[PDB]
């Protein structure tokens, strides 16, 4: 179709097939099998890489297990490495690294899989390429006897920042709770201290949620197992690269909560079979809306929302029921349910 | 054949909708 921006011709000494690797101006990478004796072009491969036109380069003998393989890195809006393993063609991205051009690199120090390159920021840098996603290892798994007293309970994400993630663990014996906060890809320190976590005492979280009642602050709501609902305030320091947690108040609830989410501006909990919508007040949480559910809904274990209008409610034994928000009525109205008994975990 | 309104003095937590709408008329 479009004008070629780069092209490279490679023979794999393993198979003996000739491959023609072509990059285009619209960010599309193509690959060709060249017939040897005649020269016919077979087995057409195509993948859209990015916005920039595709630049190619070639890496002679890189190791897969960390058997020889050759790979062609593909340069565009992002980088892609394009290899063949066990006669399966693979094209995957590279871990957080834009490259303008790329070449192999060998020392006594860096014996295998070394690579030197010019980054898009403009710096020249030496590296290793390590874990190629084959079909038996699609994911690269990054991290005396090593046993913790704390058990992980829930992982949360901030509403406005997609990159920040909050972690909550429970102590196995002492009714404590620790909280970690990893912004972007690194953990933050607690206040001005040395540690990377804050331990809350006399709390174990059944469920939790991070909710922005207003658009400039973020709040952690914990549901404790003692029928309490606790509000904290998350204060990330940004330059000291630290967070803080800070109690606001404690609110009493009738029943345990297993599902809670942000519904437009408030906190939407399910306690037992009751759907309760809460607003932030400065002495306690304030319940703005209370809806009772149909009779066969016994516990709610899961809910989800579609653009602050519809509500999908999941019962422990029955199934899904769908509700619509009545703004004038200030309640949720049920309008569909299911024919069989489904024991919902997540919806 | 128990909702809440926040009294501006903040201690209105233990009240009601219907109590707060009466105090719209007293206020």
């Amino acid at each position: 179709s479009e004008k070629i921006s780069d092209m490279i011709m490679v023979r794999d000494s393993s198979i003996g097939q000739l491959n023609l690797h072509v990059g285009l101006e619209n960010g599309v990478y193509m690959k060709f099998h060249i017939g040897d004796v005649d020269g016919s072009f077979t087995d057409i491969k195509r993948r859209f890489l990015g916005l920039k036109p595709v630049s190619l380069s070639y890496l002679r003998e890189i190791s897969v297990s960390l058997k020889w393989m050759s790979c062609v890195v593909c340069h565009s809006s992002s980088t892609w490495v394009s290899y063949t393993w066990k006669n399966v063609w693979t094209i995957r991205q590279l871990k957080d690294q834009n490259m303008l051009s790329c070449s192999k690199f060998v020392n006594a120090d860096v014996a295998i899989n070394g690579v030197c390159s010019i980054s898009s920021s403009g710096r020249l840098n030496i590296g290793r390429v390590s874990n190629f996603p084959t079909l038996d290892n699609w994911f690269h798994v990054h991290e005396m006897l090593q046993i913790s007293t704390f058990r992980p309970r829930t992982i949360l994400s901030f509403p406005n920042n997609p990159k920040s993630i909050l972690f909550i663990d429970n102590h196995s014996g002492k009714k404590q709770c620790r909280i970690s906060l990893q912004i972007d890809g690194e953990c933050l320190k607690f206040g001005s201290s040395d540690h990377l976590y804050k331990i809350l005492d006399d709390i174990d979280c059944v469920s939790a949620a991070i909710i922005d009642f207003t658009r400039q602050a973020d709040h952690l709501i914990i549901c404790a197992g003692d029928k309490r609902l606790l509000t904290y305030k998350i204060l990330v320091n940004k330059d000291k690269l630290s967070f803080d947690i800070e109690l606001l108040h404690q609110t009493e609830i009738i029943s345990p909560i297993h599902a809670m989410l942000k519904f437009k501006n408030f906190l939407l909990t399910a306690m037992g079979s009751t759907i309760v919508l809460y607003g932030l007040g400065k002495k306690q949480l304030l319940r703005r809306s209370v809806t009772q559910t149909p009779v066969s809904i016994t516990k709610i274990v899961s809910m989800h929302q579609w653009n602050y209008e519809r509500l999908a409610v999941g019962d422990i034994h029955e199934s899904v029921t769908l509700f619509i928000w009545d703004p004038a009525g200030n309640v949720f109205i049920p309008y569909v349910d299911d024919s069989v008994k489904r024991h919902v975990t997540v919806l | 054949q128990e909702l809440e309104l926040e009294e501006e003095d903040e201690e209105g937590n233990v009240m009601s909708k219907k109590v707060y709408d009466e105090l719209k008329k007293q206020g």
């Binding site: 066969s296 029955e318 024919s339 | -």
Partner: protein, 220 residues
């Protein structure tokens, strides 16, 4: 043995409980099973001592009628089955057989099932709870659902125009009463020519009118 009102207080749907449910060996187990969500009741001709489908309604059963897509093959004209040849002529047709008694187009036969009607479905398919009972008339019901869809307020068909003595271009004879009483309550948004819609729209069979995202993984 519990009484009937005693048993009705234990359940959320006391209209499901009847008098013979108190003769159960376990009325409390029986009554809670019946009021479980999505449990369908026992077919109701258990009480009767006649015979399932032995009533008078079966006298009026019509012959089978082909789905309308299959009528396009034209088999009904070539073999007539609704109401000949002597025994000598049948005997003579075995030693001298006639060929091509059916003139069916083979490309039309295949394309009925696979091209024209790959997405064909019958108009009535009983839903989850709809259990069949003896005097049920499914023919009336598909006629009634089709009667609701095509037929609309704001048009009157030619068949009724012959009966009413109301030809086209003409205000229907309750026009004056809706000038005296008013517009229909059940149609807030009905615009009628001559009351709240222009009189030059009073045109043919129409005099009035109601004037008030793709799914995940949809096929391209």
């Amino acid at each position: 043995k519990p009484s009937l009102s005693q048993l009705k207080s234990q359940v959320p749907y006391p209209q499901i409980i009847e008098w013979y449910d108190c003769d159960a060996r376990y009325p409390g187990l029986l009554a809670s099973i019946k009021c479980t969500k999505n449990v369908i009741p026992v077919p109701s001709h258990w009480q009767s001592k006649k015979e399932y489908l032995s009533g008078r309604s079966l006298l009026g059963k019509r012959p089978f009628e082909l789905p309308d897509i299959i009528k396009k093959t034209n088999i009904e004209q070539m073999r007539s089955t609704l109401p000949e040849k002597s025994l000598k002529e049948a005997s003579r047709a075995r030693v001298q057989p006639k060929m091509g008694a059916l003139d069916l187009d083979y490309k039309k036969l295949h394309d009925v099932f696979f091209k024209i009607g790959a997405n064909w479905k019958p108009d009535h398919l009983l839903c989850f709870g709809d259990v069949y009972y003896e005097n049920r008339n499914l023919f009336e019901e598909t006629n009634w659902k089709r009667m609701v869809d095509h037929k609309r307020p704001g048009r009157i068909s030619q068949e009724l125009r012959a009966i009413m003595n109301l030809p086209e271009g003409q205000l229907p004879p309750w026009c004056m009463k809706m000038k005296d009483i008013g517009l229909p309550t059940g149609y807030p948004d009905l615009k009628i020519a001559g009351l709240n819609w222009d009189i030059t729209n009073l045109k043919g069979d129409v005099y009035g009118k109601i004037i008030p995202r793709n799914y995940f993984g949809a096929l391209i």
